[PDB]
Design an enzyme around this catalytic site. Structure first.
Site, PDB file in Angstrom:
ATOM      1  N   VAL A  19     -20.503  -2.642  25.584  1.00 17.49           N
ATOM      2  CA  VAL A  19     -20.562  -2.824  24.139  1.00 17.49           C
ATOM      3  C   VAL A  19     -20.892  -4.290  23.872  1.00 17.49           C
ATOM      4  O   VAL A  19     -20.281  -5.185  24.461  1.00 17.49           O
ATOM      5  CB  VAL A  19     -19.224  -2.433  23.457  1.00 17.49           C
ATOM      6  CG1 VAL A  19     -19.295  -2.643  21.945  1.00 17.49           C
ATOM      7  CG2 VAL A  19     -18.865  -0.982  23.772  1.00 17.49           C
TER       8      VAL A  19
ATOM      9  N   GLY B 203     -22.290  -7.161  20.615  1.00 13.12           N
ATOM     10  CA  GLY B 203     -22.681  -7.461  19.240  1.00 13.12           C
ATOM     11  C   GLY B 203     -21.636  -8.171  18.400  1.00 13.12           C
ATOM     12  O   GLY B 203     -20.592  -8.591  18.910  1.00 13.12           O
ATOM     13  N   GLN B 204     -21.916  -8.290  17.102  1.00 11.57           N
ATOM     14  CA  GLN B 204     -21.054  -9.052  16.192  1.00 11.57           C
ATOM     15  C   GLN B 204     -19.813  -8.286  15.743  1.00 11.57           C
ATOM     16  O   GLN B 204     -19.884  -7.129  15.318  1.00 11.57           O
ATOM     17  CB  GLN B 204     -21.836  -9.609  14.985  1.00 11.57           C
ATOM     18  CG  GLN B 204     -22.293  -8.581  13.961  1.00 11.57           C
ATOM     19  CD  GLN B 204     -22.900  -9.210  12.714  1.00 11.57           C
ATOM     20  OE1 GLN B 204     -23.802 -10.041  12.799  1.00 11.57           O
ATOM     21  NE2 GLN B 204     -22.406  -8.808  11.545  1.00 11.57           N
TER      22      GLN B 204
ATOM     23  N   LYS C 166     -24.427  18.415   4.774  1.00 12.92           N
ATOM     24  CA  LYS C 166     -25.450  18.076   5.768  1.00 12.92           C
ATOM     25  C   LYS C 166     -25.722  19.208   6.767  1.00 12.92           C
ATOM     26  O   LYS C 166     -24.983  20.204   6.816  1.00 12.92           O
ATOM     27  CB  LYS C 166     -25.077  16.785   6.504  1.00 12.92           C
ATOM     28  CG  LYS C 166     -23.681  16.773   7.107  1.00 12.92           C
ATOM     29  CD  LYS C 166     -23.400  15.445   7.778  1.00 12.92           C
ATOM     30  CE  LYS C 166     -21.969  15.362   8.262  1.00 12.92           C
ATOM     31  NZ  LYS C 166     -21.754  14.157   9.117  1.00 12.92           N
TER      32      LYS C 166
ATOM     33  N   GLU D  27       0.822  -1.204   0.000  1.00 13.46           N
ATOM     34  CA  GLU D  27       0.000   0.000   0.000  1.00 13.46           C
ATOM     35  C   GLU D  27       0.862   1.264   0.000  1.00 13.46           C
ATOM     36  O   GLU D  27       0.664   2.156  -0.826  1.00 13.46           O
ATOM     37  CB  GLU D  27      -0.929  -0.014   1.216  1.00 13.46           C
ATOM     38  CG  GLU D  27      -1.740   1.252   1.406  1.00 13.46           C
ATOM     39  CD  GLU D  27      -1.936   1.610   2.865  1.00 13.46           C
ATOM     40  OE1 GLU D  27      -1.688   2.780   3.223  1.00 13.46           O
ATOM     41  OE2 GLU D  27      -2.333   0.728   3.656  1.00 13.46           O
TER      42      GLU D  27
HETATM   43  N1  ATP Z   1     -19.122  10.989  15.548  1.00  9.81           N
HETATM   44  C1  ATP Z   1     -19.920  12.061  15.331  1.00  9.81           C
HETATM   45  N2  ATP Z   1     -21.031  12.274  16.079  1.00  9.81           N
HETATM   46  C2  ATP Z   1     -21.835  13.339  15.876  1.00  9.81           C
HETATM   47  N3  ATP Z   1     -21.608  14.269  14.925  1.00  9.81           N
HETATM   48  C3  ATP Z   1     -20.530  14.182  14.102  1.00  9.81           C
HETATM   49  C4  ATP Z   1     -19.604  13.045  14.264  1.00  9.81           C
HETATM   50  N4  ATP Z   1     -18.638  13.194  13.340  1.00  9.81           N
HETATM   51  C5  ATP Z   1     -18.918  14.326  12.646  1.00  9.81           C
HETATM   52  N5  ATP Z   1     -20.044  14.917  13.097  1.00  9.81           N
HETATM   53  C6  ATP Z   1     -20.648  16.170  12.571  1.00  9.81           C
HETATM   54  O1  ATP Z   1     -20.536  16.202  11.147  1.00  9.81           O
HETATM   55  C7  ATP Z   1     -19.648  17.233  10.706  1.00  9.81           C
HETATM   56  C8  ATP Z   1     -18.514  16.623   9.892  1.00  9.81           C
HETATM   57  O2  ATP Z   1     -18.793  16.803   8.505  1.00  9.81           O
HETATM   58  P1  ATP Z   1     -17.692  16.463   7.380  1.00  9.81           P
HETATM   59  O3  ATP Z   1     -16.396  17.154   7.734  1.00  9.81           O
HETATM   60  O4  ATP Z   1     -17.707  14.970   7.163  1.00  9.81           O
HETATM   61  O5  ATP Z   1     -18.301  17.176   6.068  1.00  9.81           O
HETATM   62  P2  ATP Z   1     -18.502  18.772   5.942  1.00  9.81           P
HETATM   63  O6  ATP Z   1     -18.302  19.414   7.293  1.00  9.81           O
HETATM   64  O7  ATP Z   1     -19.789  19.006   5.182  1.00  9.81           O
HETATM   65  O8  ATP Z   1     -17.258  19.219   5.021  1.00  9.81           O
HETATM   66  P3  ATP Z   1     -17.419  20.248   3.792  1.00  9.81           P
HETATM   67  O9  ATP Z   1     -18.225  21.391   4.360  1.00  9.81           O
HETATM   68  O10 ATP Z   1     -16.000  20.623   3.436  1.00  9.81           O
HETATM   69  O11 ATP Z   1     -18.129  19.431   2.739  1.00  9.81           O
HETATM   70  C9  ATP Z   1     -19.125  17.948  11.939  1.00  9.81           C
HETATM   71  O12 ATP Z   1     -19.322  19.360  11.808  1.00  9.81           O
HETATM   72  C10 ATP Z   1     -19.899  17.377  13.115  1.00  9.81           C
HETATM   73  O13 ATP Z   1     -20.832  18.330  13.634  1.00  9.81           O
END
Ligand code: ATP
Length: 961
Positions: A319, A321-322, A858, A70
């Site tokens: 924790v 589960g599988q 998101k 890799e």
């Molecule tokens: N384990 C987790 N639990 C809860 N919320 C999380 C977790 N990991 C990430 N997040 C949320 O999701 C977001 C991470 O988003 P990510 O960096 O994957 O894409 P993005 O922020 O949309 O990046 P870009 O804006 O550059 O596309 C963080 O802002 C956080 O609020």
């Protein structure tokens, strides 16, 4: 018929009706499975290739060949023979790459500017066609793998992973060491006369075959164009017709069953690991027998197995589960952490697990439980957050090996058939005669006789006496174990509220009172039925001294402790919350489906304002906290550096030692007295963002407001009367070093911080463009060429409205050497910026531009973005457009002046601080091809953090936008 290089096209990939991305599946003639994703909106394109070969196929005498394979593929091909052509290309086009080798998979993934997918994918393709395997790159990259191993060699999780392997069947491929090191890739080969360069070439030519490959490509281009591109580049990957390796006989035979393992951890933790070998359940993915059982055994909530163990004062977390193994074999695990009492009753705890298992056997599989999981999984799939390209393609490429093209998206979410027969089949494997138990405690220290060869893990191995086994076999049924009841938190209202007439593109200040400041935005781009509820509670009593800090932390831990049982149904139903103390009070966040947020938030604020502490809980949570603070010493040396710098540079900051020293002063009556003080006077600053109306946001705020007022008698705390801490101002030309010792790791951690100035549009982009330019050459020079360590990081640090350049390295070399090489790298970079073309410079501007403009996919990501502006009180919601606009105006000279003013060794405004965290046995003194290091001044050595701060000025706070 389709293109002669394509066996078939699956045009109907099952997706969510919410998903606007267009999908198409391919099976190329050479056996490559392909998923294409067309996103006309995407800012970054991405691609991943997953080879269904991993560390389990490594040659007997060479552990870690596939992992080392890799590593090499990044470093040169026939078409592109430059060692860093790939990464340099990506960096200069807003991209990144990464790769991991598992037991059965080698997954290569990257993202890039959508304007440059073809060029990035071409360089990527050549990895699987004509790898160079240069001898000069081989004898250097060995260090990086050895440093990668030496980083995880003190990690508890990695030691237990290999210990499980080394205590199975030695003949079985599971026992093989996957990572590899200097001893196996260079040392021992140069004794038996083995040529590893020919062996790497052997492995690729035997196993890197198109029939064992899967690709996922995401781009702006149409599905047809993505088809032509993938065909053109990947159709000519050599099919070697390699049979897919399979491991049907379990690595854990009866000679490995009913065995007890006493393990010595690096941290002072107490953990119990119960393991059942099971058959490969992968074929049953659309019924999930193991996850039905994992849902029930791993349940938290009333009547659950954890609830009971927790109430007995034995266990805190569970924790269940599988656990995956490899094609042909799996595991079912039940892992718990232990209290002081739990460690004495390990035998009694396992008996309780079997009593729950026996209850499941007696009760029989429940249709309604499976149906509950089915519904929530299906909601989870429909309203799933739009993913980041890089991780999305990586994941898919892995999943393509397991499921039909049309079902690669829905596979692990959507369940089809309830199969009681399959559940009982697995449940039958969960028996005393089938267990492998592992106790991980510092109590076993110095009393082991066995050593794991790769990690050095100290452990004992013994058989569980048949009388203990029989006790577990003859376990009756407990009345305190009861099945979970109907999940009332399951969301049912997914109506997306009409975008209001007044709606704004940034959060708007809709409430401005002494009690509460309320920022609100209704979502105008994701249209999923979700909301983010963010609350910062400001109270001066939360961080006034170490003791009150301790009490604030303990209050909220005991609060989450008593809510967990109730809040677990919500977490399963996609409704999550986060509660933690800050340096200014409390932080509460509720995220997930908007539907039933009010009910959960109601109960949390209610429990906050009327909290009655259980004595037994307090003593247990306190002990876990005392032990937690001591466990920080066993953390990574680079993590230590980052932490201490954060403390150094803030006006007020209570150290790890200060907190644990003050913890014995914490008593129950004193904690009881503290809570009413905390809640007596509060100011709340909030962000409510997503599928909610103005009216709904204010109704949420009033409920939190009035609950506190009605129960905790909270009076408003004026924001103007809230004191905020500032960042330490370093003097011009000053260099300060703080020196601490890590007493567990044989590596040192260094953080070098070059403070620039207060955050402003200008200064922000000066730093960010410089960082962008030096980003990949820092990796290429300091790690790849110089091989200083596996961890070599360089980027902007931001804290308290201030910023600066930072370098983070973990290394076996002393900090003073690291220091000199970083300074040598800065010399090299300045000349680089001087020498570089005006169009290579514009690439870096365009690259950083894409990174900053890269839109959130998101809600929570856009929410966290807005939350950052609120936390820092900068309220710069249009930051990205303003800062990119300014970035494009920058010239080489601008960055040259910046370096000369702020960063050069002679710089009139250089503000250097360095944190040196020493390796275990390492020295304690401040004091050949390689590019030359300049002379450096004598640092001022910080002995007292507090004194150091008292003797320096502090910065202003940043103006609100
Ligand atoms: N384990 C987790 N639990 C809860 N919320 C999380 C977790 N990991 C990430 N997040 C949320 O999701 C977001 C991470 O988003 P990510 O960096 O994957 O894409 P993005 O922020 O949309 O990046 P870009 O804006 O550059 O596309 C963080 O802002 C956080 O609020």
């Amino acid at each position: 018929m389709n293109n002669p290089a394509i066996q078939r096209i699956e045009d109907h990939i099952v997706k969510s009706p919410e998903d606007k991305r267009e999908y198409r599946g391919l099976e190329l003639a050479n056996g490559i499975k392909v998923l294409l994703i067309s996103d006309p909106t995407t800012d970054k394109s991405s691609a991943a290739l997953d080879v269904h070969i991993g560390s389990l196929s490594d040659p007997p005498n060479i552990p870690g060949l596939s992992h080392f394979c890799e590593h090499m593929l990044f470093l040169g091909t026939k078409k592109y023979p430059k060692e860093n052509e790939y990464s340099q290309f990506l960096s200069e086009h807003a991209g990144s790459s990464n790769a991991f080798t598992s037991g059965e998979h080698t997954n290569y993934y990257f993202d890039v500017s959508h304007e440059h997918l073809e060029g990035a994918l071409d360089r990527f393709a050549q990895f699987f066609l004509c790898p160079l395997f240069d001898a000069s790159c081989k004898d250097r990259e060995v260090n990086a793998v050895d440093s990668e191993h030496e980083k995880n060699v003190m990690n508890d999780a990695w030691r237990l992973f290999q210990l499980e392997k080394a205590t199975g069947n030695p003949k079985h491929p599971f026992s093989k060491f996957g990572t590899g090191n200097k001893y196996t890739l260079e040392t021992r080969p140069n004794q038996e006369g083995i040529d590893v360069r020919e062996e790497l070439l052997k492995f690729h030519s035997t196993y890197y075959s198109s029939n064992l490959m899967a690709i996922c490509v995401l781009g702006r281009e149409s599905l047809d164009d993505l088809t032509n591109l993938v065909v053109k580049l990947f159709s000519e990957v050599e099919n070697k017709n390699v049979p897919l390796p399979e491991f049907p006989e379990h690595p854990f035979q009866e000679e490995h069953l009913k065995q007890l393992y006493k393990i010595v951890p690096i941290k002072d933790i107490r953990n119990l690991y119960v393991t059942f070998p099971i058959p490969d359940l992968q074929q049953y993915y659309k019924s999930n027998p193991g996850h039905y059982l994992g849902h029930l055994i791993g349940h938290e909530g009333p009547g659950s197995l954890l609830s009971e163990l927790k109430s007995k004062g034995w266990v805190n977390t569970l924790v269940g589960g599988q656990k995956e193994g490899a094609r042909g074999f799996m595991f079912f695990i039940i892992n718990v952490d232990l209290t002081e009492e739990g460690l004495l009753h390990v035998e009694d705890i396992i008996l309780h697990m079997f009593q729950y298992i026996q209850k499941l056997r007696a009760e029989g599989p429940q249709e309604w439980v499976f149906q509950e999981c089915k519904d929530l999984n299906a909601v989870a799939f429909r309203f799933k957050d739009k993913e980041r390209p890089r991780g999305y393609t990586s994941k898919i490429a892995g999943k393509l090996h397991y499921y039909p093209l049309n079902g690669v998206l829905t596979a692990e979410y959507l369940l089809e058939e309830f199969r009681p027969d399959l559940i009982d089949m697995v449940l039958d494997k969960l028996r005393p005669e089938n267990v492998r138990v592992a106790i991980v405690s510092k109590s076993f220290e110095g009393k082991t006789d066995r050593t794991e060869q790769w990690y050095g893990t100290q452990y004992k191995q013994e058989a569980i006496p048949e009388d203990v086994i029989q006790k577990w076999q003859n376990a009756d049924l407990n009345g305190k174990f009861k099945l979970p009841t109907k999940n009332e938190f399951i969301p049912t209202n997914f109506e997306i509220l009409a975008l209001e007439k007044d709606a704004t593109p940034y959060p708007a200040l809709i409430k401005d009172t002494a009690m509460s400041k309320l920022w609100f935005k209704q979502d105008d781009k994701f249209f999923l039925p979700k909301a983010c509820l963010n609350f910062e509670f400001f109270s001066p009593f939360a961080y006034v001294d170490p003791l009150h800090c301790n009490m604030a932390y303990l209050y909220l831990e005991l609060l989450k402790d008593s809510l967990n049982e109730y809040a677990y149904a919500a977490e399963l139903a996609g409704l999550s919350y986060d509660l933690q103390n800050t340096i200014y009070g409390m932080y509460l966040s509720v995220k997930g489906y908007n539907d039933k947020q009010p009910i959960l938030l109601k109960k949390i604020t209610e429990k906050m304002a009327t909290f009655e502490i259980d004595k037994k809980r307090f003593e247990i949570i306190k002990e876990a906290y005392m032990r937690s603070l001591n466990n920080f010493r066993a953390e990574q040396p680079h993590q230590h550096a980052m932490y201490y710098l954060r403390l150094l540079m803030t006006e007020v900051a209570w150290t790890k030692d200060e907190l644990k020293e003050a913890l014995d002063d914490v008593t129950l009556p004193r904690l009881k007295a503290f809570i009413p003080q905390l809640l007596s006077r509060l100011h709340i600053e909030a962000l409510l963002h997503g599928n909610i109306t103005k009216q709904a946001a204010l109704g949420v705020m009033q409920m939190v407001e009035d609950t506190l007022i009605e129960h905790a008698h909270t009076k408003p705390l004026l924001p103007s009367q809230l004191v905020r801490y500032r960042e330490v101002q370093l003097p011009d030309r000053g260099w300060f070093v703080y020196q601490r010792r890590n007493e567990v790791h044989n590596n040192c951690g260094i953080e070098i911080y070059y403070q620039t100035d207060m955050q402003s549009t200008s200064e922000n982009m000066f730093l960010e463009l410089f960082c962008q330019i030096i980003s990949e050459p820092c990796f290429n020079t300091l790690r790849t060429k110089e091989q200083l360590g596996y961890i070599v990081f360089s980027g902007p640090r931001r804290a308290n409205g201030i910023q600066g350049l930072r370098f983070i390295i973990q290394s076996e070399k002393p900090p003073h050497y690291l220091e000199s090489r970083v300074e040598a790298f800065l010399i090299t970079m300045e000349k680089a910026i001087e020498d570089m073309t005006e169009e290579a410079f514009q690439k870096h501007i365009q690259a950083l531009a894409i990174r900053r403009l890269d839109k959130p996919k998101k809600l929570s990501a856009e929410c966290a973005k807005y939350w950052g502006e609120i936390i820092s009180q900068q309220y710069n919601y249009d930051r990205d457009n303003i800062e990119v606009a300014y970035l494009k105006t920058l010239s080489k000279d601008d960055i040259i002046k910046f370096y000369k003013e702020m960063l050069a060794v002679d710089a009139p405004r250089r503000h250097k601080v360095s944190v040196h965290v020493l390796a275990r046995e390492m020295d304690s003194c401040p004091v050949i091809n390689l590019s030359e290091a300049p002379p450096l001044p004598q640092p001022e050595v910080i002995h007292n953090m507090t004194e150091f701060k008292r003797g320096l000025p502090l910065f202003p706070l940043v103006k609100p936008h």
